[PDB]
């Protein structure tokens, strides 16, 4: 759905918090607090 | 074995990368999509083909 700058991609899976695109979501997590992007 | 009933045409087949059944493949190939820009297409538009 385009591309993300400022959010790192983690190899995990949680419930969708902020919907981005084709199965990709983003959230504000801890593991320093930062914005992560996942499926 | 489900008592003689076979659901092989509606259960998914894991051979193909998209885990999709035979009837679902027929339904997907029957409807001709508009091939819209849900995947990015500015590279195809810039390259004049
Ligand atoms: C169910 O259908 C598949 C393919 O049509 C076939 O290979 C299978 O043997 C059938 N099941 C039975 C119990 O005959």
From Swiss-Prot, chain B:
Residue span of region Disordered: 33-49
Positions of the record's site feature: Cleavage: 20-21
Annotated segments matching region Fusion peptide 1: 21-42
Glycosylation sites: 6
Entry function: Precursor of the fusion protein processed in the biosynthesis of the S protein and the formation of virus particle. Mediates fusion of the virion and cellular membranes by functioning as a class I viral fusion protein. Contains two viral fusion peptides that are unmasked after cleavage. The S2/S2' cleavage occurs during virus entry at the cell membrane by host TMPRSS2 or during endocytosis by host CSTL.
Protein name: Spike protein S2
Gene, per the UniProt record: S
């Amino acid at each position: 759905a385009g591309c993300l700058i400022g959010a790192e991609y983690v190899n995990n899976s949680y419930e969708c918090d902020i919907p981005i695109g084709a199965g990709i979501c983003a959230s504000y997590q801890t593991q320093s607090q930062s914005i992560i992007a996942y499926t | 074995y489900f008592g003689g009933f076979n659901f092989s045409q509606i259960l998914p087949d894991p051979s193909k990368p998209s885990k999709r059944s035979f009837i679902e493949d027929l339904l997907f190939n029957k409807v001709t999509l508009a091939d819209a820009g849900f995947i990015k297409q500015y590279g195809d538009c810039l390259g004049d083909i």
